[PDB]
Design a protein around this ligand. Structure first.
Ligand SMILES: CC(=O)N[C@H]1[C@@H](O)[C@H](O)[C@@H](COP(=O)(O)O)O[C@@H]1O
Ligand SMILES: CC(=O)N[C@H]1[C@@H](O)[C@H](O)[C@@H](COP(=O)(O)O)O[C@@H]1O
Lengths: 261, 264
């Protein structure tokens, strides 16, 4: 019925607003999975125009409108769950840009200190990255306290590198912390499931997994599995280009032997 | 080297120890991926016998021995596509292995549970966090601990209506077992999520779900091992959503309340 309201309330809109209004009507199902940056790009308008339209429909902004749009459209298990994750792995392996991956490998190799940022289900992905970095002997820290991450990002200096782990690239405190590093000329690598988002303007490099999240599918295993695959490839490529990291894999494995039963 | 020492220094070993020395000398590649509980079973000897072999050989115990073993063995196309392919094979292997009778029972325990405690360290922290996250999406109270002191203290006072998940590929991590063991001993259900059928943890588990690809001393954290542990988490919560469609209201409401935390 929010569609019914859009058509009905479309009467008073200017040309640019009606372009976006028309776009959303004809692409309702796909817009669930688009960021504000996507919708502005796809309509050839601006983010300011999208927001202005969402406000005219009664909403606080784009995220709020998209949430309503998702609820509006929504109105064997082991094998389906597994197949959906196999598909996303495959799709992600096709999408991976090898040249940006190779630059990212060199950035990590050169980094003295790696900070990672991510909340909600992205906290799982950022944790796996920091663990895998620690396995090869890098200093890495994962923050879900976005206040502490903003404060670290704000004093960041040559030698540091940041990963912003966010499927949507639209999470306010994650973007804020990442942007502080970016504005200081610190490399920021984003791990996302969407090509264009607010975070992309604040990233020096991006890896993109398959299956963008919508309002009702955050944390979906199909979206998270591709993001974890980005982490896996990155650290295995580091291991391949710099075999000396294998000494660290070995030593970190040895020192937790005394922690076994 | 450890393998040469096993060979030559085994003259002085007893028959019982010889059986274990012989099994290892013949199966050494696979022994990397076995728990003390497997080596004992596969040789039909006690875990005490296996330990005695290990210490006779100058190691602290089975895990120390198994680590030297993997290092001793160690001296004998595109990276994206191979890393993705392993994870594919692991997912499909885990899917075929899933015991659907256990899974249905585990779903019902979760449904009944008023409080869910989750325990895991190192790379298993990632799996336990995903579980607690997916629980919180359906409106369950779930806490993930990697502080194993805190996890021990909570488990030790655990009471009717609680349920624990012990996340460990090996089921052999000392402080994780200890905390799971405390709940188990107070008759509170414990569900283990591992990548091995037999382990110290299995004898302290009400139920178990087993992912493919057992970890070895030099492959802890491998994405092909973790990807199947995460698939178990997904299938668990998706079954719940299928049996108890009312959980979809929490999925929606948990999605709604984080909208004001987006940039737009
Ligand atoms: C759509 C949705 O449910 N969002 C919530 C979580 O599920 C999600 O994991 C997290 C991080 O979002 P990201 O920054 O896009 O990964 O954001 C929100 O708390
Ligand atoms: C073999 C190995 O390196 N083990 C280390 C980690 O990589 C592993 O994730 C953790 C928990 O292991 P689990 O309890 O078997 O999951 O134990 C060890 O710190």
């Amino acid at each position: 019925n929010l569609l019914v309201r859009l058509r009905s309330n479309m009467e008073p809109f200017s040309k640019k607003l009606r372009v976006v209004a028309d776009y959303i009507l004809e692409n309702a199902h796909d817009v669930q999975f688009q960021t504000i940056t996507d919708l502005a790009r796809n309509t050839q308008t601006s983010e300011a125009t999208v927001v202005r339209l969402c406000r005219d429909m009664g909403y606080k902004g784009y995220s709020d409108f998209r949430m309503a749009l998702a609820v509006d459209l929504s109105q064997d298990i082991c094998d389906v769950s597994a197949q959906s994750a196999v598909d996303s792995l495959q799709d992600t392996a096709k999408l991976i840009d090898r040249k940006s991956l190779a630059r990212i490998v060199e950035r990590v190799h050169q980094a003295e200190f790696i900070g990672c940022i991510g909340v909600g289900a992205s906290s799982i992905v950022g944790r796996y990255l920091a663990y895998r970095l620690i396995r090869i002997g890098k200093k890495a820290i994962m923050f879900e306290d976005t206040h502490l991450a903003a404060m670290s990002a704000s004093r960041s200096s040559q030698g540091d590198l940041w990963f912003a782990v966010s499927s949507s690239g639209s999470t306010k405190e994650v973007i804020h912390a990442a942007g502080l590093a970016y504005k200081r000329d610190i490399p920021v690598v984003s791990l996302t499931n969407i090509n264009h988002s607010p975070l992309s303007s604040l990233s020096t490099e991006m890896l993109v997994a398959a299956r963008p999240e919508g309002p009702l599918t955050g944390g979906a295993f199909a979206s998270k599995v591709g993001a974890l695959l980005l982490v896996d490839v990155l650290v295995n490529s580091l291991l391949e280009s710099y075999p000396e990291y294998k000494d660290s894999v070995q030593e970190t494995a040895e020192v937790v032997i005394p922690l076994m039963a």
